[PDB]
Design a protein around this ligand. Structure first.
Ligand SMILES: [Mn+2]
Ligand SMILES: [Mn+2]
Ligand SMILES: [Mn+2]
Ligand SMILES: [Mn+2]
Ligand SMILES: [Mn+2]
Lengths: 343, 343, 343, 343, 343
């Protein structure tokens, strides 16, 4: 099944979209829900196209409707963090990803970006690069994977991974649209592939210099949601969408530094892996918003330089928390149940 | 459900629309129904494109069919008031919002613009600015909200406010089309967002210098109706569309003056609020066509200058009456059950 | 029946596709499945458009999901072999057909290209030209031929071969789209025709200089699968799609050399046919991935120069194996159950 | 949605059923699946109607298909335990509920009846009476509750508990059919009611003298499954069918003895409750097949004699284990993690 | 999908069926098709109800339409062999299973009954008893199993063997109707069960004294076809209905003699098994119309008397050939590629 809005005549929408916009420019503010994994958005009008993120004014929203404020002082604030081109509106309109504050102007329970940015600024000399692969499932509005038979299973696993064909890959139009929208918007998307079960896909984001990783992955998730809403399907990042033998279906984070990219970086990668081996429980706790767990590429080992792979994060993981934990455990040499405060 | 006209082949319509129009120009006269909240329209042909509103001739219509005239002398008059570009016809065609007169050439029961314009002209030195947020619900032709399940509720409140996704926001194509149409037509639309229940949305109009507020909000309502008619859905401004816990779902009016925008304007805002506190019943009567009721932004209080917010008007309110009452109570210092006549 | 993805609004997809892509370029790596007849693909991002195939980097994939690797070392490699323009993405994006390696960097069980390329390089002086005609059937997602009646047969054979009409040819849009996509991508497609039963078609690829034959036929098969996926139908190369009197429905390979194209080449063609007559069982074994069998054109015989036709290969045949066997039996004069190793 | 078998013409079935059966009699053997909560059945033919359970011969089945045997010796045995009239076949045909044995003629992992019967025979002097209330949900074949809107919720809780009306109770025909079938078959069903959410129902079984409780509840579950299969819906005893605020949705067991039914039995009930208070974890473990947790009726307290209520068992509980645990903790005064063996 | 005839109003049919028939009686002659596995039938009128099979006259049919005669002399003959009550017509009407002859009055290629009857008459002193279990699949008219999802699989194997529930057993109404029809008609049906995949079932016929086995199994197959035709589904005895892991899905024949039923019959069973072990290829050839292959029940071994089981015959096997081969190999001690002629 598909949503009722997807059955509206989209040619009418495209007739209205093709009107010359004028001097005004629409900016769609995007922020993370109070649940830690949802995204909320609302569009305002700017008198002119902003050249930089600093020209974007701050905004506010009702936090009581977003699961992240109390009744007495419900208003929260939106401080713009990253700016991207609007694929849906095709320019000069801008997507504005923003942080959330409380009435006290202090980071919200779900604003993990504020600290993550501080951590990345501390280790800015090492220039960390992250690459994150996000796996999702396309679902109908009836709660079942898109293109699956009603009350039924498509078939045994094996033909669908990177498959091509009407019976091999489901909803590739969503994937192509999302890829093109992320390219236009400036997201650092590096590729896509179809996963082992049909209607399950994956897009990779990276390499990114820092908080760019979290910003790009969150905006890529938003673009996926908007594109799927246009098509009338649902993008699910739940680690266990369909019950069965398949277990993980989660994000993989690739971490490198300046030293690891240069010669004799394999020993730095080994040191980082050994440091991570001690903090397994902390990373398992941090990755959840509520063969090998950590793996090394063999091509990197042959070249003795490169990156590593962490298979532990789930699909609904928060990139800010993941990257901050990876930096703290490896670069900052932190140990303990709770992170230290670099006040 | 959607209307039968929405299932006509719209590509045929766009083939006919793309014909070179020629020297003639079509103007769609729009006026307020006798009910006080409905809109009526009819298009004529002009030999040339009018540069200003004064070139638009007066027109007439059958008031017996519009609930606002008696049988003996049914004819009413249309005097053009505001001119906008026609989004639907894409230029040089014009939307003409007009006032209604009786056979006596005297303002109609529903023409509240004529007095409101006089009031705004009296206080033109203070330069009042209004901002109005209009909340509407998208409904099917079956009387239920669009995208809702038949005989059913979408789910608990909370995921839908400013939500993105096929299961989070219903009928966003209508919203995008209406936003672009209002931009092209010259309406001062400042942004939109999705409301707490799905298929419920809101657009903000403002700031506006005067009767511009009423003109822009009425033409924005007309554009919403035309766009929804193109999509085959209904835009409802009823304050209580769906029975349940949700109560208000009504317009919010933001009022500022020249003094309140300048430094030390917070005391002027406080004076206006104190004046409004006495005339609560009068404003409640005037807003109906048939936490705090009046609120102050906290950012304005921190900056000690700006505007205030009135949460009392409903969604089907008449902007002319609302703005006239706000001016009379605050700027004109009027008191009493009935307004004074500045003859 | 058609796939559920085909019922998505494709106008939305085309709106997203028309976005200006930017400096980045998407390359879709394509490789042969472990089954020997399936195709797998996945797209990456390149910083610039590659001018030649050598600029394409090597890649890797999970061979456990592709029926061609064991659990311990599942990773396989993709070495680019041929580059074509991407019809689906309309440039500068590129389709990259690649060979598969094991973790040992040794040809995979299904990588028959590596040896075939060696064989063609050995006989490069003779300049062999191959022409292959591929016959396929368009099927619904319900496992029946496209356009056929449910639980029914279209009619007696005879009106459908090269037929024109709604009741004569089924799914010609797929054929036209595939032909245009192969032209744009640079495939050497020489023509198409409709076969004796409806929804069955055939496209010819050739002439090709060498491994170009295998590359072009495999990429043409991939383009057919992608186009059919866009239309929501399935392209089947099974030699026996629908049970009945029809038997072969398989590929025909046309083989010529430099000598056979020149004058008095008919005797060379006769020598090649006599050599092939001895190795019938070997070619029957090699053609399977798991009137006359070999025929001569009469126009060639009248002109005493040209090519021959082999009707023995099936529709799901591997072009690399077919062309390698044809070269080895004719040009290399090989005899025996197993081919010799030119180490 | 409903199953495809439910859309077969049932009048044809009733025409065939009305044929005079003859001298032969069909007996449907029923046994518990290896999963501990599923039911399996298969019908044989008897030359004459059995007057007692002892005339029923033993049978066998393939335990490899029932998740309860290994490959080498898959055969299991069926020893008849209880006999009931066949509601579906309307007599002289009999439903035969049987225990399962292994090839060693030793109770199967899921045959908890064999021990429970021993325990009840030990305490046969006290004459324990049990009453069990079973709560189930009617679901479509699409995995959603029957009569619920697609992708939707019926409404707020409150109108549906014991409700009457097309919008208040869903699938009452299943309930009436199941009640009448259980009456005819001899099940001690004491009543039904509709639960707080629509399509959720409950039937009470009791009072029963002993292993009669387990036999009657299991056969009532089987009759519910057969009736729902006739109607094309699914009866689910999962404690959490639909995600949401509702939590328990589980069976309630009412336990009395001969002493508790007589005068001054309230002190015996208090002693039993105090004994149960110590073994909470053991009963929680035993109830799972993989206000107050224990409550006392107030009418019993006013009359100072009667029974108690245990709210702890879930809906998918095994009655044999529940009743055996209740007897062992109260009557047998057992304490400890594992039960004692009365060998 | 179901056949179009199943969607006719069956109440009309039952109104016509309930008419008092009168003195005339309808007899439906049934014979085996020329293909060896199909059944053909046609009904005549008798002036009175026949008390015995000998009162049934011989008939004839067009063998050119039945794949078992040449053009010059197409007529074949029907000699009545067995008489049963007509379940479909509810008495006094009779089903007449008949042998087929050629114009020469000599057994037809597919009339294997004539010889089988001779063989059984030779060994009539030993009184052989056979029991045959027939496994079939219910299919829609679209060629897929009944109740399966379109283009889909129901689920993993394991819940369906002897399952009860709308999601566990498909088309049980067909099974109940067929069981009751076979009981009424006098078929020696001993029971049914649901098989490992849904819509697959099995009925057992036996014990039978001789050619009674072939007669009863063929008439049971005919009754299954007629009942399924009434329901609009297809009964398939193909050994491999749905491609996949499941392989056999074929009939099991249980063979006993007078000696094997008496004490110390286990040695006779062992002798029969040893004789069968030599003639495996002959029985494999004879069973086809175009753990252990032969197994012994363990209960029989414990009681040292009873029967054996042959798992080798397929589902579409001819019972006459199977029983004749079992008698010839065991009782007649025959050896060789071709059977001896007891002329
Ligand atoms: Mn990975
Ligand atoms: Mn407000
Ligand atoms: Mn040919
Ligand atoms: Mn209770
Ligand atoms: Mn068997």
């Amino acid at each position: 099944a598909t949503s009722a809005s997807s059955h509206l005549n989209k040619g009418i929408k495209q007739v209205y979209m093709a009107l010359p916009q004028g001097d005004k420019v629409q900016a769609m503010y995007i922020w993370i829900d109070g649940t830690g994994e949802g995204l909320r958005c609302k569009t305002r009008t700017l008198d002119s196209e902003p050249k930089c993120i600093e020209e974007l004014p701050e905004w506010n929203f009702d936090g009581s409707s977003t699961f992240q404020s109390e009744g007495s002082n419900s208003d929260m604030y939106l401080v713009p963090a990253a700016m991207f081109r609007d694929p849906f509106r095709k320019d000069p309109n801008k997507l504005v990803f923003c942080e959330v504050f409380k009435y006290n102007r202090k980071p919200a329970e779900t604003n993990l970006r504020h600290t993550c940015k501080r951590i990345m600024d501390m280790v800015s000399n090492q220039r960390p690069w992250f690459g994150m692969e996000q796996e999702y499932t396309l679902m109908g509005t009836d709660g079942h994977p898109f293109g699956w038979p009603s009350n039924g299973f498509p078939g045994p696993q094996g033909p669908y991974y990177c498959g091509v064909g009407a019976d091999k890959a489901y909803g590739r139009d969503i994937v192509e649209a999302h890829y093109r929208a992320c390219l236009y918007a400036g997201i650092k998307i590096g590729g896509t592939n179809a996963e082992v079960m049909p209607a399950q896909w994956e897009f990779q984001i990276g390499p990114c210099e820092g908080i760019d990783m979290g910003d790009h992955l969150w905006v890529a998730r938003f673009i996926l949601h908007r594109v799927c809403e246009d098509f009338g399907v649902i993008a699910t990042f739940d680690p266990k969408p369909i019950p069965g033998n398949w277990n993980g279906a989660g994000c993989h984070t690739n971490f490198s530094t300046k030293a690891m990219r240069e010669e004799n970086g394999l020993k730095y990668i080994e040191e980082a892996i050994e440091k991570l081996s001690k903090r397994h429980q902390y990373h398992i706790r941090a990755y959840d918003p509520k063969g090998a767990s950590i793996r090394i590429p063999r091509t990197v080992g042959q070249e003795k330089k490169g990156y590593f792979e962490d298979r532990r994060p789930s699909a609904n993981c928060d990139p800010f928390a993941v990257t901050e934990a990876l930096i703290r455990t490896c670069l900052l040499n932190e140990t303990g149940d709770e992170p230290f405060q670099y006040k």
